[PDB]
Coordinates of C-alpha atoms and ligand atoms in Angstrom, one line a residue:
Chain A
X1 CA -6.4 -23.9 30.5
X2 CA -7.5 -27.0 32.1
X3 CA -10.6 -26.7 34.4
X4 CA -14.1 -25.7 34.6
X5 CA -16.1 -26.1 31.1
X6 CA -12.7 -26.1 28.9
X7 CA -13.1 -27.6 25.6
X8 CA -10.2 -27.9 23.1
X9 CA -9.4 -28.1 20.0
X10 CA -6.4 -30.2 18.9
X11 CA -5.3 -28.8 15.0
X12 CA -3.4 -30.8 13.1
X13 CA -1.5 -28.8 10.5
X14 CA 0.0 -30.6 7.0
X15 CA 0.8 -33.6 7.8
X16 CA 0.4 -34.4 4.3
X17 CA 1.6 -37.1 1.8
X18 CA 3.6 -34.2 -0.2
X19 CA 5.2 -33.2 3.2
X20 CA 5.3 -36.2 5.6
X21 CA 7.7 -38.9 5.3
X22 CA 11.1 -40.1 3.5
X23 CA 9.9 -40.2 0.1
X24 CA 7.5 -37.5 0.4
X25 CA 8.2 -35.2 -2.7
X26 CA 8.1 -31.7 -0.8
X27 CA 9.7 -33.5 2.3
X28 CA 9.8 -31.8 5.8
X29 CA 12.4 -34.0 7.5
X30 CA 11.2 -32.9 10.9
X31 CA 7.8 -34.1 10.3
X32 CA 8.5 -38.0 10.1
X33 CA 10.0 -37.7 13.4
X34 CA 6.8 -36.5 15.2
X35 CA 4.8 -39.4 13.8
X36 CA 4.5 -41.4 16.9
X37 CA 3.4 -38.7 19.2
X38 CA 1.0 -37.4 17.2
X39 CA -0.7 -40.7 17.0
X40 CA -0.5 -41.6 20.3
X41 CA -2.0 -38.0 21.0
X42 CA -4.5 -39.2 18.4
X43 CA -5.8 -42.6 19.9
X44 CA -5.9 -41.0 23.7
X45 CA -8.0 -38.1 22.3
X46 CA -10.8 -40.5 20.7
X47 CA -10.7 -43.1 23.4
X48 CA -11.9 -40.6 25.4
X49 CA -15.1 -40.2 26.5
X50 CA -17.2 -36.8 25.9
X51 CA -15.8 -34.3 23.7
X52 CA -14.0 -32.0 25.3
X53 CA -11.1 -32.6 23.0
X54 CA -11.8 -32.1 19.6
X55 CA -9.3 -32.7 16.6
X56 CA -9.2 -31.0 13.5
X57 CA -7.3 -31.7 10.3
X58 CA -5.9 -28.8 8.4
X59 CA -4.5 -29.6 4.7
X60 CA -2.7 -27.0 2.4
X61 CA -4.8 -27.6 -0.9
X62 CA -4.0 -24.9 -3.6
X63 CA -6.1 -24.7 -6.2
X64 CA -5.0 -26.3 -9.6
X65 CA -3.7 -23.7 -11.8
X66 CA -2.7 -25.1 -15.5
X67 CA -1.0 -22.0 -16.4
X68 CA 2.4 -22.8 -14.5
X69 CA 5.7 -23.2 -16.7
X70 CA 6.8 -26.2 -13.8
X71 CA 4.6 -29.6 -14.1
X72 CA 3.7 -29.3 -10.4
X73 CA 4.5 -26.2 -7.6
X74 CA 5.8 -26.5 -5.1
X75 CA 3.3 -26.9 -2.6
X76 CA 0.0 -29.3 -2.2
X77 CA -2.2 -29.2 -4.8
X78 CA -5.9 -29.7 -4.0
X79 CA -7.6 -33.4 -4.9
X80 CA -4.0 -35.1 -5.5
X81 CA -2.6 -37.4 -3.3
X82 CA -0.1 -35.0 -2.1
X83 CA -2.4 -33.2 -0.3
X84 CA -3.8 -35.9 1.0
X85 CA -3.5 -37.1 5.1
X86 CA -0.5 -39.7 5.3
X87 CA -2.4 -42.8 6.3
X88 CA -0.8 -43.5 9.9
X89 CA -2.6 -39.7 10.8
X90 CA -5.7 -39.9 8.8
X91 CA -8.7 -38.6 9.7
X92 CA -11.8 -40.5 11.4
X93 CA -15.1 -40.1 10.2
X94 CA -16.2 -37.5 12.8
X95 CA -13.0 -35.4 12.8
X96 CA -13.8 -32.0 11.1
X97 CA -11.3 -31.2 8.1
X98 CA -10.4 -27.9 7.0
X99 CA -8.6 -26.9 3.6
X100 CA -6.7 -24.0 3.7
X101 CA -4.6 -22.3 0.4
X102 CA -2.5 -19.7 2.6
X103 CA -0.5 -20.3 6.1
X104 CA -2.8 -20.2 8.7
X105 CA -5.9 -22.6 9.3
X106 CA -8.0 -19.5 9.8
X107 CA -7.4 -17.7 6.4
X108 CA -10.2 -17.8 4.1
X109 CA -11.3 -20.5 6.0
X110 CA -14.1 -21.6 7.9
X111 CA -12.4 -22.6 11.3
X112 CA -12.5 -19.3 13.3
X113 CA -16.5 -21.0 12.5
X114 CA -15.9 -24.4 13.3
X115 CA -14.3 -23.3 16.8
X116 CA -17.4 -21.0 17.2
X117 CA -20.2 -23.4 17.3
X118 CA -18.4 -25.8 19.4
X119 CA -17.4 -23.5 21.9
X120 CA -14.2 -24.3 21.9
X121 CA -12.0 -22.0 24.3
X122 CA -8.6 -23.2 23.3
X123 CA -6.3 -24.5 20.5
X124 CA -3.6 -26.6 20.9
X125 CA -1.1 -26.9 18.3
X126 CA 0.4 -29.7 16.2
X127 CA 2.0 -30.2 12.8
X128 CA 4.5 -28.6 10.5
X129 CA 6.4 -26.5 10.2
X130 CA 6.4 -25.4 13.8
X131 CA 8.0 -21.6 12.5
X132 CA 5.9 -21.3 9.4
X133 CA 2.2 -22.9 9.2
X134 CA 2.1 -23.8 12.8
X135 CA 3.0 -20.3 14.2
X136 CA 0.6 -18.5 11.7
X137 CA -2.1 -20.8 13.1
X138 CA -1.2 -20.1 16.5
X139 CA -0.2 -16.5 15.8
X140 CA -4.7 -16.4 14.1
X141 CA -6.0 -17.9 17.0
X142 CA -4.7 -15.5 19.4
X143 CA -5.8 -12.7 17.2
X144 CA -9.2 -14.3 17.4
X145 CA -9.4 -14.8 21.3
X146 CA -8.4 -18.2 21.7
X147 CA -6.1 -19.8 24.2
X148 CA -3.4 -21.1 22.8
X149 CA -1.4 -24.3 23.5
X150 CA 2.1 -25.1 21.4
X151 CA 3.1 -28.8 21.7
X152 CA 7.0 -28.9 21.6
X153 CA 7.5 -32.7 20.9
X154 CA 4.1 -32.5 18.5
X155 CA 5.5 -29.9 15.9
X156 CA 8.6 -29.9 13.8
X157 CA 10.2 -27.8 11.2
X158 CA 12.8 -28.4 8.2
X159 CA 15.5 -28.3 10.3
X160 CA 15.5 -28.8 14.4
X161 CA 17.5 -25.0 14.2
X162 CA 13.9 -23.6 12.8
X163 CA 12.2 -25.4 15.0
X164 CA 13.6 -24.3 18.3
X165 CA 14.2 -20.9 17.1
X166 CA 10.0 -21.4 16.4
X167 CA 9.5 -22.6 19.6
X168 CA 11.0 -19.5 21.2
X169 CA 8.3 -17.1 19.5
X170 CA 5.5 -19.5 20.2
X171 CA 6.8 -19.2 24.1
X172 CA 6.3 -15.3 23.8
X173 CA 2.7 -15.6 23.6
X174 CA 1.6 -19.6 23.7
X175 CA 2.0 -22.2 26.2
X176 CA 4.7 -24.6 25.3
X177 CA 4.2 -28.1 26.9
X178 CA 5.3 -31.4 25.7
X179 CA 2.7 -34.4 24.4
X180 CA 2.8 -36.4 27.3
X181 CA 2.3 -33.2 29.6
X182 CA -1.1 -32.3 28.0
X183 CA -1.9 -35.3 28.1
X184 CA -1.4 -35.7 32.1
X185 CA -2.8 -32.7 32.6
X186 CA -6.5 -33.5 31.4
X187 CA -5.8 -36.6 33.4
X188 CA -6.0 -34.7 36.7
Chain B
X1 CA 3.4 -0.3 -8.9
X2 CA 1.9 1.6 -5.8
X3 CA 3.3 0.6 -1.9
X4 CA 2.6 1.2 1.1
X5 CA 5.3 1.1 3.8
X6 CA 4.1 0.2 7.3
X7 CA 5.6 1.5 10.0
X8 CA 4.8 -0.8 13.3
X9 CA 4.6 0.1 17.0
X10 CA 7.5 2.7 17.0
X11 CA 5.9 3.7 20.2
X12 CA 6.4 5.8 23.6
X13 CA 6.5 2.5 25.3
X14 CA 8.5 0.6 23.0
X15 CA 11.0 2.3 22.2
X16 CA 13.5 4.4 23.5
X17 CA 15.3 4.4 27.1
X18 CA 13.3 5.0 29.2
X19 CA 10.6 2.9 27.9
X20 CA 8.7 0.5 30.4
X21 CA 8.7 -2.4 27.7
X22 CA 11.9 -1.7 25.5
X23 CA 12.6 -2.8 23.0
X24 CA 16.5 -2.6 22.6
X25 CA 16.7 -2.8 18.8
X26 CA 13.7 -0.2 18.4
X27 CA 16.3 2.4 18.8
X28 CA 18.8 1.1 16.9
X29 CA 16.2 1.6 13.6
X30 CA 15.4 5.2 14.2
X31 CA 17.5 7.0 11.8
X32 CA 16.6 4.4 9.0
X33 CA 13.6 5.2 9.3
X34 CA 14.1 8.9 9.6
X35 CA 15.4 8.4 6.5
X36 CA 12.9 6.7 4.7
X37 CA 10.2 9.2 6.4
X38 CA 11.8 12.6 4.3
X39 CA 12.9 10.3 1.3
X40 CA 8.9 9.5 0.9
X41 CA 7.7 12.6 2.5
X42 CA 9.5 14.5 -0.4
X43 CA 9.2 12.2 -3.0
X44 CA 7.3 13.1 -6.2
X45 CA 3.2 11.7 -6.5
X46 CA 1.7 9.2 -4.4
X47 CA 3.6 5.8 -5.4
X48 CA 4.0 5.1 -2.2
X49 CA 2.1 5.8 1.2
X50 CA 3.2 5.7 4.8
X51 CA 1.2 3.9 7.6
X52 CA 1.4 4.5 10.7
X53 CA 0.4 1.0 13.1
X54 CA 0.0 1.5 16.7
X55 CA -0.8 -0.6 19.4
X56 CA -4.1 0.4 21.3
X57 CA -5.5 -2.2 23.7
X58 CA -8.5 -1.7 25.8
X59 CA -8.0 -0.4 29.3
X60 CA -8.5 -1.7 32.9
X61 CA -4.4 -6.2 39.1
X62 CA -3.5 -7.1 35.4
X63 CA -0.1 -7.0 33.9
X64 CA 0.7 -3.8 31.8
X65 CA 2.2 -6.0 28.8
X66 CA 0.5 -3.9 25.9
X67 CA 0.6 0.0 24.9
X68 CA -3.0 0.9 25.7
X69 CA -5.4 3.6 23.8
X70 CA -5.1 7.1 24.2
X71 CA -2.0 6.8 27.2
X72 CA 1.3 8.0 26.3
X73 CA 2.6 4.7 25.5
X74 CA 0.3 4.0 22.7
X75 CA 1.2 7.1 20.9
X76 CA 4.4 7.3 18.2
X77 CA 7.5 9.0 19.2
X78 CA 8.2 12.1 18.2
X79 CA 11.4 11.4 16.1
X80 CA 8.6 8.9 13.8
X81 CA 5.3 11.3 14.1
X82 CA 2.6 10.9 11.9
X83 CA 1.8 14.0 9.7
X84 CA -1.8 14.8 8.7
X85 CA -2.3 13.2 5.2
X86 CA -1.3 9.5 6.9
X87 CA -2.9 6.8 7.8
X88 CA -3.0 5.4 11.1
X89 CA -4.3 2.2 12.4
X90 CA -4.6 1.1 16.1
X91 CA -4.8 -2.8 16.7
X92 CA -5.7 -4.4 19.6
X93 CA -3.8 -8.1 18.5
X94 CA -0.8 -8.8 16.9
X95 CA -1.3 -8.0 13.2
X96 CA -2.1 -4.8 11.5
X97 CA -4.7 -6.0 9.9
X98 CA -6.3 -8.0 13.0
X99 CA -9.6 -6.6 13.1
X100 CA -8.6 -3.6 11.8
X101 CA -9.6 -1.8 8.4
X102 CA -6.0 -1.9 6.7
X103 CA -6.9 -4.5 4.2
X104 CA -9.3 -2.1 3.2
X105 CA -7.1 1.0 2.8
X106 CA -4.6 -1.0 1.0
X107 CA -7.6 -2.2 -1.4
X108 CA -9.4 1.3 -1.5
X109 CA -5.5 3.2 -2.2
X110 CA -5.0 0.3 -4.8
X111 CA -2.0 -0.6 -3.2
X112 CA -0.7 -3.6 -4.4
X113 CA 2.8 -4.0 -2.1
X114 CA 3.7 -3.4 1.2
X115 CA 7.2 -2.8 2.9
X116 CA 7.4 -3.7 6.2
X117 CA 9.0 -1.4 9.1
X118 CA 9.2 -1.6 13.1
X119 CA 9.4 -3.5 15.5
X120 CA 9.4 -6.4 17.2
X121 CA 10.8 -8.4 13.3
X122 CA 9.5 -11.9 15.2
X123 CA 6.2 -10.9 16.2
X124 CA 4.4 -8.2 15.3
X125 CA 6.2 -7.2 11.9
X126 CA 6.3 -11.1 11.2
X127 CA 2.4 -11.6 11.3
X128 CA 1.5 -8.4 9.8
X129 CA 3.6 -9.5 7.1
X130 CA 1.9 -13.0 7.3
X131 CA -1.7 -11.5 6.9
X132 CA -0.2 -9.5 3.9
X133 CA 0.5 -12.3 2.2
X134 CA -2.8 -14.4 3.3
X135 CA -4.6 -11.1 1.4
X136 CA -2.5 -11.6 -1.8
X137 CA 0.0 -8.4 -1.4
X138 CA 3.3 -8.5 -2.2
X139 CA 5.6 -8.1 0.3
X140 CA 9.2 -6.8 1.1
X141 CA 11.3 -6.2 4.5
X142 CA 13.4 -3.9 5.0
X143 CA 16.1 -5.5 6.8
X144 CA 17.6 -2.4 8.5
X145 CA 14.3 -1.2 9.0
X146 CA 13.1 -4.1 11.5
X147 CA 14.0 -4.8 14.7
X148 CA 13.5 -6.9 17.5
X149 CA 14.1 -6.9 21.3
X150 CA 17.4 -9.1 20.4
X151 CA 19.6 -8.9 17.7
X152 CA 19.3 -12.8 17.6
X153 CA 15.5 -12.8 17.2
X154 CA 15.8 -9.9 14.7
X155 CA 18.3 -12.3 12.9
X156 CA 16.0 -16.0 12.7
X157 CA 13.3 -13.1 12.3
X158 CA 14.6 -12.4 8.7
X159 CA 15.4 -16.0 8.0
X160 CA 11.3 -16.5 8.1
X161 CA 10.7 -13.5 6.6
X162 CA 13.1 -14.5 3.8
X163 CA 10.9 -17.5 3.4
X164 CA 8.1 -15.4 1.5
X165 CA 9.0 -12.1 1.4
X166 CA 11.4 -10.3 -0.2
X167 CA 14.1 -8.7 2.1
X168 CA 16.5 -6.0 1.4
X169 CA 18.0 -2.9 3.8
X170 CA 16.3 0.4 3.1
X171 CA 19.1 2.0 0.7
X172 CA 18.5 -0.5 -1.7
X173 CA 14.4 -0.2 -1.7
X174 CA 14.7 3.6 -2.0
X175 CA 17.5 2.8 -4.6
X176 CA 15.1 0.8 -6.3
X177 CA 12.8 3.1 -6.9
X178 CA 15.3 4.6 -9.7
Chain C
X1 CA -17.7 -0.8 -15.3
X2 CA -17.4 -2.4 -18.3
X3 CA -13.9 0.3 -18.6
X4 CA -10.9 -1.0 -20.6
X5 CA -9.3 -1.9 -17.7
X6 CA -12.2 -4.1 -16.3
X7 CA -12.2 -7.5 -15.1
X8 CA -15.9 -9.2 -13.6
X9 CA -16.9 -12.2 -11.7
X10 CA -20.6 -13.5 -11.8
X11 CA -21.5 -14.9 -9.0
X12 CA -23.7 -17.5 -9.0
X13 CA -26.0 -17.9 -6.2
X14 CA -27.3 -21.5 -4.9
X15 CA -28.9 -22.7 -7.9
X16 CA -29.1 -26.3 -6.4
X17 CA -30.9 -29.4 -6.7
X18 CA -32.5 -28.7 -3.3
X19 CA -33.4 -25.2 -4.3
X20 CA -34.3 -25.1 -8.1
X21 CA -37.3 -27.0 -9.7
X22 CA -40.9 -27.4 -9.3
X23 CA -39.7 -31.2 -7.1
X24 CA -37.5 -29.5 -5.0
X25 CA -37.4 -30.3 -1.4
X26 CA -36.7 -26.4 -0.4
X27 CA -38.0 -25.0 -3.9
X28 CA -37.8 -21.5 -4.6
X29 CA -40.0 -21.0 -7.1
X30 CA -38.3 -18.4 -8.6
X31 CA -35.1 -20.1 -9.3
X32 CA -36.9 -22.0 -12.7
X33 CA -38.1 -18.8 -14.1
X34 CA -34.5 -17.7 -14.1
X35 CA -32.6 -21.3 -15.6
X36 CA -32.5 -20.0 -19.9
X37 CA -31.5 -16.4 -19.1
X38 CA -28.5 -17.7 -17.1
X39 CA -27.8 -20.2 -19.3
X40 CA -27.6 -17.4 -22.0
X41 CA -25.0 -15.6 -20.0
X42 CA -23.0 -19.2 -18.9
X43 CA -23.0 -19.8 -22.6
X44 CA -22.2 -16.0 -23.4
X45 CA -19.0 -16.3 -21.0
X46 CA -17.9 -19.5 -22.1
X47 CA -17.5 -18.3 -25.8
X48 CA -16.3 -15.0 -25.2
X49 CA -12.7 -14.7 -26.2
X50 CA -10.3 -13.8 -23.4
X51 CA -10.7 -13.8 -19.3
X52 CA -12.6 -10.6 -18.9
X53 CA -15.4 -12.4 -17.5
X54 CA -15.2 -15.5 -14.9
X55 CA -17.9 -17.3 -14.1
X56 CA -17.9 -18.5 -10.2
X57 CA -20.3 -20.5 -8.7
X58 CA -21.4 -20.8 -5.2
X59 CA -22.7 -23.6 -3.3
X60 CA -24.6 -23.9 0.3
X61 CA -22.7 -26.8 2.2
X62 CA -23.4 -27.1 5.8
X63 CA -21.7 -29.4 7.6
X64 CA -23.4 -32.2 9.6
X65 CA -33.9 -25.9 9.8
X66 CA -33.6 -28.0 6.7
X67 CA -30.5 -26.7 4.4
X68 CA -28.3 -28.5 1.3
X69 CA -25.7 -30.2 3.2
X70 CA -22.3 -30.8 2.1
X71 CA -21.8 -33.7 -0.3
X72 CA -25.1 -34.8 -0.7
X73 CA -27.7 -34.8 -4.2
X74 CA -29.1 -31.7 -2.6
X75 CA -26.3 -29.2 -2.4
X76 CA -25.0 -30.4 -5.7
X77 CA -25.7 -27.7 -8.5
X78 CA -28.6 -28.5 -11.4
X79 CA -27.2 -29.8 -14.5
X80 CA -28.9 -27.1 -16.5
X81 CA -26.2 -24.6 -14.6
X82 CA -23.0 -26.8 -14.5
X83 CA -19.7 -25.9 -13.3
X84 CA -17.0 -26.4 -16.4
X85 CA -13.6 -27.9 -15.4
X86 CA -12.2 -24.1 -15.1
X87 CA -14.9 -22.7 -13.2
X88 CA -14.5 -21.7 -9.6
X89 CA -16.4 -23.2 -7.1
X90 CA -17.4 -21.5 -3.5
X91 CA -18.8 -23.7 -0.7
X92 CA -20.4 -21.8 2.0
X93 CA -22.1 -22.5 5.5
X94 CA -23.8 -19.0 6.2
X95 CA -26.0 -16.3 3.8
X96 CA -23.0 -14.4 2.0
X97 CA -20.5 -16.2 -0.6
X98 CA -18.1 -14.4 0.9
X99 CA -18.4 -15.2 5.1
X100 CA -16.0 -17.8 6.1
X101 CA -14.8 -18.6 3.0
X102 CA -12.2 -17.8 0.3
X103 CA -13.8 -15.4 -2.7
X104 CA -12.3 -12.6 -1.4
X105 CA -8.8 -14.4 -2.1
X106 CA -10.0 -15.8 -4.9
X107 CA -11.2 -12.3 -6.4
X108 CA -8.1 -10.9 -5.8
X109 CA -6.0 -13.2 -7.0
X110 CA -7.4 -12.8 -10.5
X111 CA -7.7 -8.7 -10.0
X112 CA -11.6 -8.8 -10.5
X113 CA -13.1 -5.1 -9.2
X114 CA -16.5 -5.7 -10.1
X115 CA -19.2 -8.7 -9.5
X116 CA -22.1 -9.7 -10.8
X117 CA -25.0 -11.2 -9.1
X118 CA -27.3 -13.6 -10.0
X119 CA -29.0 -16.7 -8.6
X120 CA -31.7 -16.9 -5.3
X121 CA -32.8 -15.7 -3.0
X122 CA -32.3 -12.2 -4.6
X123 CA -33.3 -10.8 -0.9
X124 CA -31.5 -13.3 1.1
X125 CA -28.3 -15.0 0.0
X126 CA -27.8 -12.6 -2.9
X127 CA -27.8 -9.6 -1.2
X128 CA -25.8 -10.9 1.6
X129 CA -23.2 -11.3 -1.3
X130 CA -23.8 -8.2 -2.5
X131 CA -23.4 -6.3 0.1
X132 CA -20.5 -7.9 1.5
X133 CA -18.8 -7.7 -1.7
X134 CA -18.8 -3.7 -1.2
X135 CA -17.5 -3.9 1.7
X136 CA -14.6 -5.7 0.4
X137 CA -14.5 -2.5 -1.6
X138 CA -15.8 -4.5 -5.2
X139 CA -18.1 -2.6 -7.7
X140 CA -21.3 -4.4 -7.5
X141 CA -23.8 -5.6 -10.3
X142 CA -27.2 -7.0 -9.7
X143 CA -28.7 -8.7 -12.5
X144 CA -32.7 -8.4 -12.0
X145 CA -33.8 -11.2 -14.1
X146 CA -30.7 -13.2 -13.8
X147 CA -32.2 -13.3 -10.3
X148 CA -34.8 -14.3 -8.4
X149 CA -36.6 -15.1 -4.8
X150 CA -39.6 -17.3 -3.2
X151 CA -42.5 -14.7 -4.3
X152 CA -41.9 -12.2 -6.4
X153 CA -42.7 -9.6 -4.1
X154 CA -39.6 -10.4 -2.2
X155 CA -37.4 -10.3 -5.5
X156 CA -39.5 -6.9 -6.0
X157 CA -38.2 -5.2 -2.2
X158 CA -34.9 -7.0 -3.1
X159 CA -34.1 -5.3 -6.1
X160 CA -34.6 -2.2 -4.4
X161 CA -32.3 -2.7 -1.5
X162 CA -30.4 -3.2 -4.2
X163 CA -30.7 -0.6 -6.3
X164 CA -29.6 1.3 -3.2
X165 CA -25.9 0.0 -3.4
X166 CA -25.2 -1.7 -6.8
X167 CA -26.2 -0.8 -10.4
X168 CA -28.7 -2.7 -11.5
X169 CA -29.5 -4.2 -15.1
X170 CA -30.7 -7.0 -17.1
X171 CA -28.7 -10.0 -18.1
X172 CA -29.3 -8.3 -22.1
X173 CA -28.2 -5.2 -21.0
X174 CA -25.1 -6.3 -19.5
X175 CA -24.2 -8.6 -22.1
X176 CA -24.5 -5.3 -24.8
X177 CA -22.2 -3.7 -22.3
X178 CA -19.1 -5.9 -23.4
X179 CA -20.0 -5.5 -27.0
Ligands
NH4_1 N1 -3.9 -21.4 -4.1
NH4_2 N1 -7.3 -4.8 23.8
NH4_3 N1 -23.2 -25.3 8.8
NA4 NA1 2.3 -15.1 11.8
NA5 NA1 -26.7 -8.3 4.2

């Protein structure tokens, strides 16, 4: 996990303007409450030097469909603002993006690629919701012969219930670790 | 409206008693499924299909934690045995359709829902159902169908499966389909 | 094919600024012969009453040896083959229009069996659409001169690879089909 050649790759799943926040129209109440780590995760990972940390942004971005009966779904369309980054965990110029319209990161999507060409042996999860669009992610990476690295106090769910209970499945077959943990333990 | 039900990892080393990696709840399904086995097994046409999923890691001072090909342990038990017009998949990850050709079948069979069966409801049955969904099926769980190592997991198991699937116990699907 | 029940996607194949035009940085010179037949068929499509037909075009976008890169001039499709506001759009970083990306989904979203290929290379990108698009168990037109490649020699072998996997027709003969 944290020796030898390892390079990983931090994803950072929906924390989106629909999603993230008090006023956030499709709100995931867990998700404000991660804010701080996640950013503090962020500025160690680019003040440090090499890259054997990589993040990646994933956004849900469904594709506009006009023929709805509701004036917006309920999930984050594509170009709006919704499915936009929320400002305090945008992205940084070199920071590779991904779009994704179903669960996981890695369906229909180009990151199984990404992850490929940088040789990246291990992903380390963060975002929301840890049970739903975390797991999948976690659940795809595994499938695909990654590593697999669940941060506890860098995920959230709707409710802290779904978000323990998602803890326990990610324990079956991740490594569960707290922010400040992963961080130490590069620090070796 | 064509399904396919997919029955997953009712195996030798899953379930049962005397299994080396039981799964408690494994048993508790059997006779469900039983049921659903003659109900489509005698059913009129070919709305529906039966898959059979098993677990079939590679072999070879490593921790036996999977069913592996071609041993004892991969194979279905007897109570759940495949007959000859079925389908079978073996997977070597989580999901059924993890490298696998199911999405295909599904496709080439036209199917256009599948009904989810087995065992463990949190992990394997959830991200089979997961990749389902991610290949634009439809999909239901059959609530009495499932099972998981605890009746606890089994239960927060259906409460994501909920989420985006359509649950309901196996009288009711079968029920349905009058 | 053109059954009752059918419902098609034509896939166009990198017809880009970088690609397309006697100017153009990584010309294929077969991609101008093809620009009015295809814009006889986008016209065709767009007019046509109901959603039988979609039109879905595919763009090379690598990320940041010389290829169309994502966001730039380059990668951006010519104005003579447009995108309209309904009209799917495909980025890719490898050969096929399927391979790491989300047609697949896409196609079966809308219940599409059958696509249509046109665009360049006809023995590079197109068939690697092609043929990847019968794997995902799709029926498979090629359009011969809604297609084209660097030399016409290589359009020539490609057609026949082709022909080997996917019915083949012109872009007349498939529009009579619908008629
Ligand atoms: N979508
Ligand atoms: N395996
Ligand atoms: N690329
Ligand atoms: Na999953
Ligand atoms: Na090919």
């Amino acid at each position: 996990y944290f020796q030898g050649m390892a390079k990983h790759a931090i994803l950072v799943i929906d924390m989106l303007n629909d999603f993230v926040g008090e006023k956030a129209p499709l709100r995931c109440p867990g998700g404000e409450t991660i804010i701080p780590d996640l950013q503090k995760i962020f500025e160690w990972v680019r003040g440090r030097e090499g890259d054997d940390i990589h993040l990646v942004h994933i956004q849900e971005a469904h594709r506009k469909n006009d023929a709805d009966f509701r004036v917006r779904p309920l999930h984050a369309v594509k170009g709006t603002w919704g499915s936009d980054f929320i400002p305090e965990l945008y992205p940084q110029e070199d920071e590779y993006i991904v779009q994704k319209r179903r669960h996981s990161g890695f369906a229909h999507t180009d990151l199984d690629l990404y992850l490929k060409e940088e040789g990246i042996d291990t992903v380390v999860l963060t975002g929301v919701w840890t049970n739903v669009c975390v797991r999948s992610t976690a659940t795809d990476a595994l499938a695909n012969a990654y590593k697999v690295i669940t941060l506890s106090d860098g995920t959230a769910s709707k409710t802290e219930e779904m978000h323990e209970y998602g803890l326990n499945d990610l324990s079956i077959f991740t490594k569960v670790m707290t922010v400040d943990q992963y961080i130490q333990a590069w620090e070796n």
